[PDB]
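Exercise (ungraded).
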Amino acid sequence: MKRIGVLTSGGASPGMNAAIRSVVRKAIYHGVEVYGVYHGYAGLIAGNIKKLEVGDVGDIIHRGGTILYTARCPEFKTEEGQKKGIEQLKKHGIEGLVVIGGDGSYQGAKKLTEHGFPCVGVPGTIDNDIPGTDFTIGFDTALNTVIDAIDKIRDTATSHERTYVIEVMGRHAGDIALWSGLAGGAETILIPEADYDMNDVIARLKRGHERGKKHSIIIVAEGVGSGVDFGRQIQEATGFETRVTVLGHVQRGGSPTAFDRVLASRLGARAVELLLEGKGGRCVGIQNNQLVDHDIAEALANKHTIDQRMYALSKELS
Amino acid sequence: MKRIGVLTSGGASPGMNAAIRSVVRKAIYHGVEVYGVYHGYAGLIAGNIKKLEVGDVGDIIHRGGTILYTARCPEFKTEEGQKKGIEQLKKHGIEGLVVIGGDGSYQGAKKLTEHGFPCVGVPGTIDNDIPGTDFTIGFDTALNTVIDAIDKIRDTATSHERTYVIEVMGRHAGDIALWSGLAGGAETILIPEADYDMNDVIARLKRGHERGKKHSIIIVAEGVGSGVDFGRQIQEATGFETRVTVLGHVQRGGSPTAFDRVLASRLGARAVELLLEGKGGRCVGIQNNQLVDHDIAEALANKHTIDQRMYALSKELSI
Amino acid sequence: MKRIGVLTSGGASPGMNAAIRSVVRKAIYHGVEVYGVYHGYAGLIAGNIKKLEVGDVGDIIHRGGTILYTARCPEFKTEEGQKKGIEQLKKHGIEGLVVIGGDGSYQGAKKLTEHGFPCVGVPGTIDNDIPGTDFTIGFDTALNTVIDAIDKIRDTATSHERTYVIEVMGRHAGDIALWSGLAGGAETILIPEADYDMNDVIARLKRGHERGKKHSIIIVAEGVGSGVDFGRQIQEATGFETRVTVLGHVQRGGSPTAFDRVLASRLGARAVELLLEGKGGRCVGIQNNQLVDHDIAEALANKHTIDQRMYALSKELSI
Amino acid sequence: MKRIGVLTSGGASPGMNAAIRSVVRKAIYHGVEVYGVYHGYAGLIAGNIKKLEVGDVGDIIHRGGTILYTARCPEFKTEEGQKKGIEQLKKHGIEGLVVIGGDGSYQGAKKLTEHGFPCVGVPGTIDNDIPGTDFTIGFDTALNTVIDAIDKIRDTATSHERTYVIEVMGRHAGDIALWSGLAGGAETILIPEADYDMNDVIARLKRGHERGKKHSIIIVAEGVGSGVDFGRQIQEATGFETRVTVLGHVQRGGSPTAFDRVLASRLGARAVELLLEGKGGRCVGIQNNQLVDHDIAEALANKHTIDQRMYALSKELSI
């Protein structure tokens, strides 16, 4: 390929810029041209396209967010929209596309290949909810953002404010909550992939309160419910003053950790390799500490799960 | 004096441990013993008191929280509680008490000295709402905790998600919201002191959406209302999708910044000087970048005010 | 005036971007245009100049370094260079210049002012060594970068290997060393502004070890000497294993703290006010926690000092 | 078992406390008592041992260092010391030992193992140089400490000072340098496990400035040489001003990252299970993202390697 393109879609994840940097440098290394597609598939249809030079990625490896931006584009989820995209790619001489984003962005990667445009998906999201990869780019950073908040909460325990609820992201995937909860030494972790009894939870608060536990910290994945609601119900049920933190989109931001930069760099480069190998409709990932790549359709067909042992471990440790 | 005591009261504040360290080390340097009182005034009344050795404060300067803990004590708001408190101090041969905390800790200090027991207040709280000091110990750390959140939100630029409400601590004082908002480049800051026109907030929003502004960040002091409420109001009224962060007690936690450890070290040491030089019923502070102390009652009689020019400036820099 | 300019000179300082943003926004608030001058005085001479739009500082408040870049320029020390600069300014319609930087950047502002061109200086450097201000923009951030290192070192103590020497920046000023050493609980601090005695030092270290002091941390301002050398000088004197950290230029990098962003915002805006009021040849600062401005020549005439009580306090607390 | 023990040996490593916490909590869940052995093997021989209550580990998961302390012990490398150790263990009714530390600590585990005392090794070090595991507890945290410095150096840019040398830890392993180098966007990485042509290095450096590279960063593992010496070679060969930063022991310090805390928790817990399962003379680890365990002596026979494709990757990306 003489020229490829790269875009980000699905909302920000720390390490997207590291991944863009890798795609650009890896391709330029092999003599390939790289074009930035701004604003995701929306910018693709709109022809918001511009060459990325070696220097254009020379100061971004440590930056959060994405220099290419992202934008939702339902228009691309249609035939006429995909056609506008294809047309814009051909007009710019772009022969293949690296798509960095969430599972949603993958669908578009697939369609493009079917119409003779090799596209490879790179997992950029904090959710860690993409099949065919143990870890998505940004998950590690989000975890550290979450434990930063948990650590600070540990300093604030008094006798009358001793119970804390922290709501983290994770609409369907409990990964953020589970890993954060374990690393944060949380007493209770509520996730969608595991059922919980609010009585067992309240019972656990009291047991801790009895043996003199300095603080009870409850981690709640957003997919399970509102931090505000859980906290209010707990206070209502126990008489214990309950304080609530809702991190929100903070979890998507900040400079990527070392693990995210490294993962981003490897997957990004791997994506370029696949295109040059003539492969397409593939997504990259890491599995058992090894770089893998799967057919998009096959990968998307699996169901994401969490490590139950780790969930169980977290209960033992508290 | 041969023996003094030290205690922490009110919410946790980053730098409390640095203040405790300073109290202990400054006293020991002058050949005075320091006894730790645990759990604030509740612990004082209960007699939860124990000598602090030089090594008990050797690894705390950089630690958040307070090794002495804090606990509510309504009883100490009565003659009975004050008497019990004094009984315990006397029983342990404690001749003066350094109290590190917020507004309500100072009331206890005033009452104590009105009862003939030497007591000095040190301003330990994040919300900068203590008389006789430009800055309380913990405020600067809290500010940095808030902008950490704001900075991360600036990395999340989705075209349809560019409106963010962040609820910070305040209640009565808008200092945290004001300083973190100015430092964080917030578009709008809602503080309890000033009036706000929701009409103005929305117009400023739209004005920024038109000009292509990538992030609209609104800081709301809890004293003004709930971030979630405002987020809903703003989305209902503009159709701009609005995301909300409520930081909560994260703002009280974490390792103190350099400024807070310095302030804490200087102020804790001064409180000791005041006790050893016969003074009492005073609180320490920093004003116009100078170490000061005041009669507690006199200081408590002044209303706290936010810097009005800084508020005005923040509005000039956003637009 | 209807058009001003702004540039950055001297080493990079965290908060420079916050200052730039404030200059642009404040000017724009009063209907005035701002043109950025890139690569410092060098860029001013070479005519590297471009208008700054409101969107060009819309995302920098939290960024370290400077989007206008900085560079050395000996030519601007000469009258030919200075003239070529005004030439370039008047070519672009710039009626006043804001200069954000260290000592050196102030000389150029003096000269431009001697040549009848309205210029105001803003103190941007980490070493706190700029007259007419208690604190320079960047100082607070550097202290926090230093204590982050000191904090990590505390985690690595081991009774046999427990003596650490950290060398910090500050060419001729011991502010960084003094504040960071007080904030980090250092046992000993070496700065140009106070005589030291390695014997008095060695004894400290031993008395500390005698009573089982967990760790011994020594902070050394680079203007006093090398840390690697004080390290070697300390081992063969006590037999104590000694580790040395030299931080170097990390102290200049990083996102500015809340205090630096606030200072930078207040000083930047004040610099614009001065120009628009026709009051060039000044520098701005904060003194006794109030905003101030001074004639540059007069300010530069003042010698730099530190708070001796604070140095004395750090000695008292490290027992 | 009714009662086991845990200690830490080798340098300090972030996550040791999370590991200690997990050993203690996991044991308690199974109704086993845990006794702390302070100061590693030195303390074991000396009988520096005390029961750890469930509350002794209640606030350490996020703390750097180790509450049990670490110490060197040549004595334990001898038959006599080993027996005194076992004697002290029996003396306290300790039936099994969890050893958290570096490969030095594993030797002692193997030895207590040849003596028929149940011991499980847990890999706690930053250099990632321990057999039977892809990652050691503390490695990830150290990487992030290194890139924090590299990131700040990026804010420090000029035409004059554009070349930076950073010396990082690792002992005999290049892992820290390779991973931090890749994560930090280093132009050149010098590690023990791969040959380097200094002229290629020099040539690559010039190649970069010719094309106006923002900053040139070079990472040097300490086991390859001295940062200061490389920086001199480079300034002398290019005339480019080269600033050296030697991070030193700061890399061992700080609060563990999420991954280190999770790793520590899992490996600590697994280590206890192995003792209760009547195993011993094993070390635990993570390989291919799965919990594993191996015979100590066997694992100790494997040579350390790094990912060479990763190394090549770093070369490709820094053009």
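Further reading is listed at the end of the chapter. For now, observe: Chains C and A do not touch (no CB pair under 8 Å). The first strand of chain C starts at residue 3 and ends at 9.
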